[PDB]
Amino acid sequence: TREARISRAKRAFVSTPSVRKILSYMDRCRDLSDLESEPTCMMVYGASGVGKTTVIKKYLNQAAAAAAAGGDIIPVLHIELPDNAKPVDAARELLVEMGDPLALYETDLARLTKRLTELIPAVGVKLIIIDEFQHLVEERSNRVLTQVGNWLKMILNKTKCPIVIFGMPYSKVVLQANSQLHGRFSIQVELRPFSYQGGRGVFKTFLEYLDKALPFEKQAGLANESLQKKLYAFSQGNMRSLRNLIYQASIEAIDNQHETITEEDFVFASKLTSGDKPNSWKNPFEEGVEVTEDMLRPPPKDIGWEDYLRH
Amino acid sequence: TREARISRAKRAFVSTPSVRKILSYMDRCRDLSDLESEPTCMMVYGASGVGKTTVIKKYLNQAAAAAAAGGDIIPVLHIELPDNAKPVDAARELLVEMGDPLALYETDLARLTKRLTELIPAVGVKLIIIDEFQHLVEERSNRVLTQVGNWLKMILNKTKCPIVIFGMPYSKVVLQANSQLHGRFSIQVELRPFSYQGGRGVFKTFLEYLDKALPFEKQAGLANESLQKKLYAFSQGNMRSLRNLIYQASIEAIDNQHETITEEDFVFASKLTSGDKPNSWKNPFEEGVEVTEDMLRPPPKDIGWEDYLRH
Ligand SMILES: Nc1ncnc2c1ncn2[C@@H]1O[C@H](COP(=O)(O)OP(=O)(O)OP(=O)(O)O)[C@@H](O)[C@H]1O
Numbered sequence: 004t005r006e007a008r009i010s011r012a013k014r015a016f017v018s019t020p021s022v023r024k025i026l027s028y029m030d031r032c033r034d035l036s037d038l039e040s041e042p043t044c045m046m047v048y049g050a051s052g053v054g055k056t057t058v059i060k061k062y063l064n065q066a067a068a069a070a071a072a073g074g075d076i077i078p079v080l081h082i083e084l085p086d087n088a089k090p091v092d093a094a095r096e097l098l099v100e101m102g103d104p105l106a107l108y109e110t111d112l113a114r115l116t117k118r119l120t121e122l123i124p125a126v127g128v129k130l131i132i133i134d135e136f137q138h139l140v141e142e143r144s145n146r147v148l149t150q151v152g153n154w155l156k157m158i159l160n161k162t163k164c165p166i167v168i169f170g171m172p173y174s175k176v177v178l179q180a181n182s183q184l185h186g187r188f189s190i191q192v193e194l195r196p197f198s199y200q201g202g203r204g205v206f207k208t209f210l211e212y213l214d215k216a217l218p219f220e221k222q223a224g225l226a227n228e229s230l231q232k233k234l235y236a237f238s239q240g241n242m243r244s245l246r247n248l249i250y251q252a253s254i255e256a257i258d259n260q261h262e263t264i265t266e267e268d269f270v271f272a273s274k275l276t277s278g279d280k281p282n283s284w285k286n287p288f289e290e291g292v293e294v295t296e297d298m299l300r301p302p303p304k305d306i307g308w309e310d311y312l313r314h
Numbered sequence: 315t316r317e318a319r320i321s322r323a324k325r326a327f328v329s330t331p332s333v334r335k336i337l338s339y340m341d342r343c344r345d346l347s348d349l350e351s352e353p354t355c356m357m358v359y360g361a362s363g364v365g366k367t368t369v370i371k372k373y374l375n376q377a378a379a380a381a382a383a384g385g386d387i388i389p390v391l392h393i394e395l396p397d398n399a400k401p402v403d404a405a406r407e408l409l410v411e412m413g414d415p416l417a418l419y420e421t422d423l424a425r426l427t428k429r430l431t432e433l434i435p436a437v438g439v440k441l442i443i444i445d446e447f448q449h450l451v452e453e454r455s456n457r458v459l460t461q462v463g464n465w466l467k468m469i470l471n472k473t474k475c476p477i478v479i480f481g482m483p484y485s486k487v488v489l490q491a492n493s494q495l496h497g498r499f500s501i502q503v504e505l506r507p508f509s510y511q512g513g514r515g516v517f518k519t520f521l522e523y524l525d526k527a528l529p530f531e532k533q534a535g536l537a538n539e540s541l542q543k544k545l546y547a548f549s550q551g552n553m554r555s556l557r558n559l560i561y562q563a564s565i566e567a568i569d570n571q572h573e574t575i576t577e578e579d580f581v582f583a584s585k586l587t588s589g590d591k592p593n594s595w596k597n598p599f600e601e602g603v604e605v606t607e608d609m610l611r612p613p614p615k616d617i618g619w620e621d622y623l624r625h
């Protein structure tokens with residue numbers, strides 16, 4: 004097996020220009036705040052499985068690794084809101100994640116607000132990264148509960164620290180709900196999936212560097228005329244479904260001792276990770292799926308909105 | 315009677331490839347942690363009566379028998395959380411199980427956290443095995459109380475010692491509740507029941523080696539065309555109900571001096587241990603139960619989820 008080779012196939016990061024744009028803006032957002040004046044506050048949108056969490060994890064490592072190794076400093080944070088979050092819930096989650104208080108027994112919302120305003124300049128917080136902002140949309144109705152948004156405005160104005168709220172694109176209406184919180188988050192970037200198949204685009208050079216990063220020694224066959232068309236036909240832009248197929252195909256080619264990823268175990272990997280794919284979607288790998296013009300259209304505008312459009 | 319023979323029938327371990335996978339990963343999880351850097355932290359799921367407690371007991375014996383015989387060292391632990399556990403409750407249970415403090419009079423959660431962090435490197439703890447993780451799911455509501463989970467993250471980061479949390483499959487949502495605790499427990503294995511009857515599978519060789527291990531001298535008749543079909547028809551994959559039937563049949567054949575386990579006392583053992591079995595299930599042993607295609611389907615995906623799906 005060589006689980007070292009398996010973890011090498013699973014932990015493969017390839018920097019796209021969109022990711023490097025987000026990382027440059029994140030480094031900018033941090034280094035601009037003097038923690039006296041009002042911070043910059045970026046909002047980053049992005050659909051289901053574009054690589055937002057990977058961006059936050061890549062930033063976390065490249066920023067706070069040596070500083071966390073130095074001592075209890077924790078310069079940048081990573082917060083994942085709970086579903087249908089109250090200000091007290093997201094406040095105490097922010098508290099128990101940041102350093103080591105108790106903070107989750109005494110829930111009175113005011114004294115724990117005083118605690119984390121006492122503690123944020125104490126440890127030396129430079130940035131707050133919130134991952135889930137679509138949780139403030141109620142599930143079945145379309146009201147967006149503005150208690151956490153107003154509390155975020157409160158904690159932003161009380162202790163001047165830059166907040167980079169990540170979320171799905173239909174979380175925009177939560178920022179549209181509060182006009183003050185809308186005015187605060189000026190910088191808005193859209194981390195949207197891969198665009199076209201025609202070749203010599205960002206998708207080809209991405210698959211070229213991922214072909215380089217795969218643990219096979221000689222070639223993996225990606226980013227050629229035939230296989231790139233079949234790859235985009237399987238996974239439109241969704242980074243996660245593409246990486247899942249490549250991961251399942253890689254570990255399949257590792258299991259039965261092979262040369263590289265070939266058109267032997269890729270078909271098996273396609274039939275394996277085609278459970279989530281929609282009703283009218285066709286698997287381009289099986290017996291005789293002539294990959295069409297209609298399969299290779301760019302992803303729509305409302306790609307990460309559909310759950311909001313469903314009600 | 316010969317209670318020696320009875321204890322021989324009761325204590326019968328047969329290693330499956332799934333159990334050897336869990337034991338190899340457990341030995342790996344222990345021997346990788348240097349107790350300076352962040353440990354590996356495996357999660358092992360498994361339904362109601364797959365043989366989790368037998369795996370922990372087999373590991374406990376094969377690991378810590380000679381070291382516990384040497385002196386007060388206790389390298390590996392075995393912890394069974396109480397129901398609706400608070401951090402102080404599971405903390406003091408961990409304390410009073412590990413070595414010999416008093417530890418269960420002074421409940422202040424902070425000084426006993428300090429006590430067990432003082433004591434874990436003192437005695438030389440190498441591994442912590444937690445058996446019940448589904449207790450952190452509240453009974454009638456579907457909130458999963460995250461105080462014990464956050465305390466487990468706390469004790470993991472404070473003293474770097476590998477924790478192998480066992481539990482039922484619907485305990486997964488407790489690991490989904492805390493994103494940091496989710497990120498920590500990377501290695502996740504599913505100890506699921508036996509799959510098919512068709513023959514020449516893991517079930518046949520399992521019953522072959524269990525036929526060997528039984529205290530009868532000549533044969534027990536298991537893992538043949540007829541009896542294997544009747545055996546899977548009685549107990550789908552549930553190791554405990556299979557082993558109970560075999561145990562009751564064995565001690566029935568021991569009571570009235572017999573040659574082996576025959577189709578005389580097996581019918582009596584079937585009617586004896588068929589109380590727990592569901593409403594629509596049929597006993598394949600009684601008078602004329604022609605064992606059908608519909609009886610021998612593999613166990614479902616959500617085999618250990620049903621109590622979570624009930625509310
Ligand atoms: N630049 C990259 N190179 C290679 N793989 C990548 C890259 N970016 C992301 N991935 C992969 O994409 C997958 C998507 O996981 P991730 O959780 O980051 O997505 P996400 O968009 O945050 O999902 P969600 O919206 O559900 O939170 C991961 O398996 C990750 O390894």
Ligand SMILES: Nc1ncnc2c1ncn2[C@@H]1O[C@H](COP(=O)(O)OP(=O)(O)OP(=O)(O)O)[C@@H](O)[C@H]1O
Binds near residue numbers: 363365554
């Ligand atoms: N490999 C094996 N060979 C023979 N018998 C086994 C094997 N594994 C488990 N058993 C038997 O299966 C039964 C189940 O016991 P055990 O408590 O280990 O299951 P469990 O899934 O942990 O149950 P619970 O979750 O209720 O604690 C025991 O009687 C044990 O002897």
